[PDB]
Design a protein around this ligand. Structure first.
Ligand SMILES: Nc1ncnc2c1ncn2[C@@H]1O[C@@H]2COP(=O)(O)O[C@H]2[C@H]1O
Length: 1051
């Protein structure tokens, strides 16, 4: 008639809602009172027949549809909630701990059950009991570990051990369930090891295959969220169902691998789809847990509680104690092996993970499967009663005492920098609330509002609210503006000032890294590496953030460059030629290859079975595909040395002669013919799929190298940008001079080393580096366009729907950018000469510079630029990396920069010396050609204006970053603000300039200016002070006074 199942599911939803709402403050989890409510519902169902009808329709469910409905959701959410980078960083330890602890804990619990329980269980049923018992589902422990500050890696350790524990526990449970409940099978040794191999490898391989197909499908979906959600759900359920039923493999491990790969590659999912998928899968797992606990309670009080004794409760208590003891001995036994890992466990983490073994819904569902499979036997009832009791006892006692245990062991204390940061944030929020309240007290609409309720509601308080001696010492090392006492430093006081300066540097570097993350410049994993290295340097005595510990991020070496180099070596290569030159023949032979492949596998199948003489041997295999299209028209009639020298063409010659042997065997037309036909087809397929397969492996290897190079470039850029900002802010926090000099020296040598190593990193792999730089440039342009769209929307100049269309356009472009070519070929030096910032617009000027350019090759160690020598040319680095030594500033100039602007402009001997750190090719425009180019052009953007604008940007950027370092704008914002401005001509201004209030900054780039009604004649190029009202300029020959301002933006 009508479904009672929807009534039970909605009732479980409402009961879970009341359970979650009413038990927020209590430390008892909502699952235990869900079990209590399920037991109450089961006993009224045993009394009242209508509730008996509802519970008999739902809770007396088949074991199979119980597994295939609830298990994929729980397993996929456990895999998808993971921090997969931290899990993969400690994957060996988690894998060995979970796997070996599962095996030895299952046999120990099995031996315990056989030696302790009165029931005459055999060895296999006892491993089934141990497999149910050792499956752990801690969620409250991982929530407490994520919430309570430090030991963040221990929660990932516990979660990964739990996920692999659940997967392999259901695997060993299914193995012994098939052993016990269905004992009709008798097997040999070979079939048994084939079954073990099939389960163990064909779980993860099937999961890997469906995960790769799903990632490929999700990479090619734009502007449709609902389809992405449906393929995630359908891929999970289809992977589990096809693996468990059709392939007869372990489907739990397939969903584990699929969830780990989908959580690993989260970038082809759109971010709103990603956050909805996280919330949606958490909601689905909550639904599964609530339903599972309610049916567990119902069948426990209906059938599992009809056969219990006092000895059963005693066995439950001894089983709980021995399960905790067994897990403790497992961890204590594997402690040295787990200790010789890069994240070794302490005694506190071992005790926490011992007590964090909370048995959950997975073992309860397996106990339901055992109960329904056993039938009227008491084995399922005993399994169900002991599993429910172990779950209840572990949940209650372990949860309350794990909160208490985290309190006592000293892993719940808030750290002093976190406490100071939270106190400062709370004080800032309080000051802002007071200022907003004083604003709202003098507003005409809101003056009459009662303010007692306003201060009662809007009151943020701080959550945190030998240690005293340490805090007193840390406050004692503070020679700041709090106290005004002049003195002379002491050597011990110098040691404390050294330490305080070093911690202030590392703390400011952590703020630099978080500022880089919040502005969409750093990656998240790069941020975690830089912050981790900063805090590791902070925990040591004198160790700064070194470069050797940062080089491991961009260590490109490994399996993948060796694979790339060897596959490049295999496919390096070297009238009738032109049709081969079009390359459209090769795709036709490849499609012909696959259309040859599949039906000869069918003919293999039909002689394995051994109709109309099998279709007359399938028209003699289409006369062997018309003898391979007459051997590709006799290889287009024997194209000479091009066919002669290629070993690939040598085995196509082998193919054609073996096909001629197939002709003479058809002429002979027994057993030798079939085996040789087998060898023909298998060889043909494998060595002709190899030519298609090798470039696909080349792109896969290039993608892996691209990911590693992107991480390394992101880490290096984060260190360099943070080191720039910290070296620009360091003057305020450090008062001593020699301390400042030492700190600047280490900062500069680290900066130079990282810039050099990134330059040689670009030199090593050209195409991959060009690909990651193109990807980062497109991402930066798209992010700033999205910010422009948001600022146009927030200013009211664009309505909501049209702004949403523009954001959808840039988001679709970003998703296309995620599916990029992994190795863009490097551009020619003509293209790099074309794309120069002072040479972008004018095409005629591009033709003149190409007519006047000479490529000049230099070896290692030659000098390009001499300081004493007069300026005779311009240089453009098209490849290679150069060093600079100048009077002392040291920098390394990369590909696409220009060397010599002020030399060719203001006619002075060169300021620096440039040498080659690798072999370099530069474009040399001789100075007389620069002068005839500078004369022959009179457009509104002129080369004189463009070159002076490029150099004006370069000098003005760190000088503006000096003043705004207190304000905290990054270098990118300074460059974007300065990019808005233009050089202003004094010839139109009659050599008198006025400063306006509208002008944000005024920087003179070159020359001497008079200021403030001849108050002082400023010779040094710098930012013109706002105190200066106007500047009057004087003509001096070859002085050429250039000032570069920006105006404020107008809506
Ligand atoms: N502070 C700097 N940062 C980057 N490049 C510089 C710096 N100073 C000089 N250069 C470059 O080094 C070149 C040396 O010779 P030039 O002075 O003709 O032009 C100079 C600039 O191109």
């Amino acid at each position: 008639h009508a479904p009672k199942v929807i009534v039970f599911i909605s009732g479980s939803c409402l009961f879970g809602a009341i359970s979650r709402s009413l038990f927020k403050k209590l430390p008892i989890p909502y699952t235990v009172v869900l079990l209590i409510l399920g037991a109450i519902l089961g006993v009224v169902a045993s009394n009242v027949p209508l509730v008996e009808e509802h519970t008999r329709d739902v809770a007396h469910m088949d074991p199979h549809v119980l597994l295939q409905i609830f298990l994929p959701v729980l397993i996929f959410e456990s895999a998808f909630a993971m921090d997969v980078h931290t899990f993969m960083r400690s994957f060996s330890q988690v894998c060995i701990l979970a796997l070996f602890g599962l095996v030895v804990a299952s046999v120990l619990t099995a031996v315990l059950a056989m030696n302790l329980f009165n029931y005459n269980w055999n060895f296999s049923e006892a491993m089934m009991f141990g497999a149910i018992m050792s499956a752990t589902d801690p969620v409250a422990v991982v929530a407490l570990l994520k919430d309570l500050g430090a030991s963040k890696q221990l929660g990932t350790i516990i979660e990964g051990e739990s996920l692999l524990n659940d997967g392999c526990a259901i695997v060993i449970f299914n193995v012994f369930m098939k052993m016990v409940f269905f004992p009709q099978l008798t097997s040999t040794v070979g079939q048994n090891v084939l079954y073990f191999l099939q389960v163990a490898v064909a779980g993860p391989l099937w999961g890997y295959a469906v995960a790769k197909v799903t990632v490929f499908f999700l990479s090619h979906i734009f502007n449709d969220a609902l389809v992405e959600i449906t393929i995630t759900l359908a891929a999970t359920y289809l992977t589990y169902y096809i693996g468990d039923i059709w392939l007869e493999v372990s489907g739990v491990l397939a969903v584990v691998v699929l969830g780990l790969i989908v959580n690993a590659e989260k970038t082809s999912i759109s971010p709103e789809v990603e956050v909805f998928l996280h919330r949606f899968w958490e909601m689905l797992a909550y639904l599964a847990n609530t339903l599972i606990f309610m049916m567990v309670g119902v069948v426990v009080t209906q059938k599992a509680l009809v056969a219990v004794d006092k000895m059963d409760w005693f066995y439950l208590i001894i089983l709980y104690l021995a399960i905790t003891i067994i897990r403790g001995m497992v961890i204590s036994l594997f402690s040295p092996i787990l200790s010789r890992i890069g994240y070794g466990l302490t005694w506190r983490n071992a005790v926490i993970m011992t007590w964090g073994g909370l048995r959950g819904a997975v073992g309860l569902a397996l106990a339901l499967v055992v109960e329904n499979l056993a039938g009227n036997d008491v084995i399922g009832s005993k399994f169900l009663f002991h599993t429910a009791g172990i779950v209840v006892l572990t949940l209650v006692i372990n949860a309350t005492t794990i909160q208490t245990l985290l309190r006592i062991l000293g892993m719940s204390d808030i750290s002093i920098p976190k406490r100071l940061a939270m106190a400062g944030a709370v004080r800032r929020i309080h000051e802002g609330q007071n200022r907003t309240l004083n604003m709202l007290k003098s507003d005409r609409f809101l003056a009459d509002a009662d303010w007692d309720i306003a201060t009662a509601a809007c009151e943020i308080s701080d959550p945190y609210s030998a240690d005293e001696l340490t805090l007193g010492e840390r406050k004692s090392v503070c020679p700041g503006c709090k106290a005004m006492v002049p003195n002379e430093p002491s050597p011990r006081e110098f040691a404390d000032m050294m330490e305080e300066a070093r911690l202030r540097m590392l703390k400011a570097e952590k703020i630099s890294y978080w500022k880089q993350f919040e502005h969409g410049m750093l990656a998240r994993e790069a941020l975690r590496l830089l912050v981790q290295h900063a805090e590791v340097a902070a925990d040591e005595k004198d160790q700064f953030i070194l470069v050797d510990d940062l080089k491991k991020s961009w260590q490109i070496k490994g399996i993948y460059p060796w694979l790339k180099r060897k596959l490049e070596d295999l496919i390096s290569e070297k009238l009738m030629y032109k049709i081969c030159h079009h390359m459209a023949f090769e795709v036709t032979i490849n499609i012909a290859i696959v259309l040859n492949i599949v039906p000869i596998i069918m003919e293999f199948v039909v002689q394995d079975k051994m109709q109309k003489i099998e279709d007359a041997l399938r028209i003699s295999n289409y006369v062997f595909f018309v003898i391979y299209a007459i051997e590709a028209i006799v290889k287009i009639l024997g194209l000479g040395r091009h066919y002669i020298v290629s070993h690939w063409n040598k085995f196509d010659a082998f193919i054609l002669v073996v096909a001629l042997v197939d002709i003479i065997i058809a002429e002979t037309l027994s057993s030798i013919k079939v085996v040789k036909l087998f060898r023909l087809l298998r060889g043909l397929r494998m060595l002709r799929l190899t030519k298609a397969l090798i470039p696909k492996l080349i792109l896969v290897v290039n993608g892996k190298i691209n990911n590693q190079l992107s991480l390394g470039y992101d880490v290096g850029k984060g260190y360099i940008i943070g080191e720039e900002e910290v070296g620009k802010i360091i003057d305020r926090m450090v008062d001593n001079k020699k301390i400042l000099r030492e700190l600047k020296h280490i900062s500069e040598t680290g900066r130079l080393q990282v810039v050099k190593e990134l330059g040689l990193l670009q030199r090593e792999h050209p195409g991959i580096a060009v690909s990651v730089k193109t990807r980062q440039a497109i991402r930066t342009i798209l992010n700033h366009s999205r910010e422009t769209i948001h600022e146009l929307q927030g200013a009211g100049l664009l309505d909501e729907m049209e702004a949403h269309k523009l954001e959808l356009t840039v988001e679709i472009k970003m998703k296309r950018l995620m599916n990029a070519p992994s190795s863009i070929p490097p551009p020619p030096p003509e293209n790099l000469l074309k794309n120069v910032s002072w040479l972008a617009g004018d095409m005629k000027l591009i033709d003149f510079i190409k007519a006047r350019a000479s490529l000049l090759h230099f070896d290692y160690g030659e000098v390009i630029v001499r300081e004493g020598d007069e300026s005779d040319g311009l240089f453009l680095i098209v490849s290679g990396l150069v060093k600079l030594y100048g009077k002392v500033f040291e920098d390394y100039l990369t590909v696409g920069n220009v060397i010599g602007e002020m030399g060719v402009l203001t006619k002075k001997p060169r300021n620096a010396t440039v040498t080659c750190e690798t072999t370099v090719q530069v474009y040399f425009i001789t100075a007389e050609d620069m002068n005839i180019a500078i004369d022959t052009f009179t457009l509104y953007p002129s080369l004189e204006y463009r070159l002076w604008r490029v150099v004006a940007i370069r000098i003005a950027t760190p000088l503006i970053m000096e003043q705004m370092a207190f304000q905290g704008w990054t270098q990118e914002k300074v460059k974007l603000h300065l990019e808005r401005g233009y050089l202003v001509d004094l010839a139109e201004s009659h050599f008198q300039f006025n400063i306006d209030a509208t002008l944000e900054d005024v920087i003179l780039i070159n020359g001497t200016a008079y200021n403030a009604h001849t108050r002082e004649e400023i010779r040094s190029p710098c930012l013109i002070s706002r105190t200066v009202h106007k500047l009057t300029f004087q003509y001096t020959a070859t002085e050429e006074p250039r000032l570069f301002v920006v105006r404020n933006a107008e809506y």
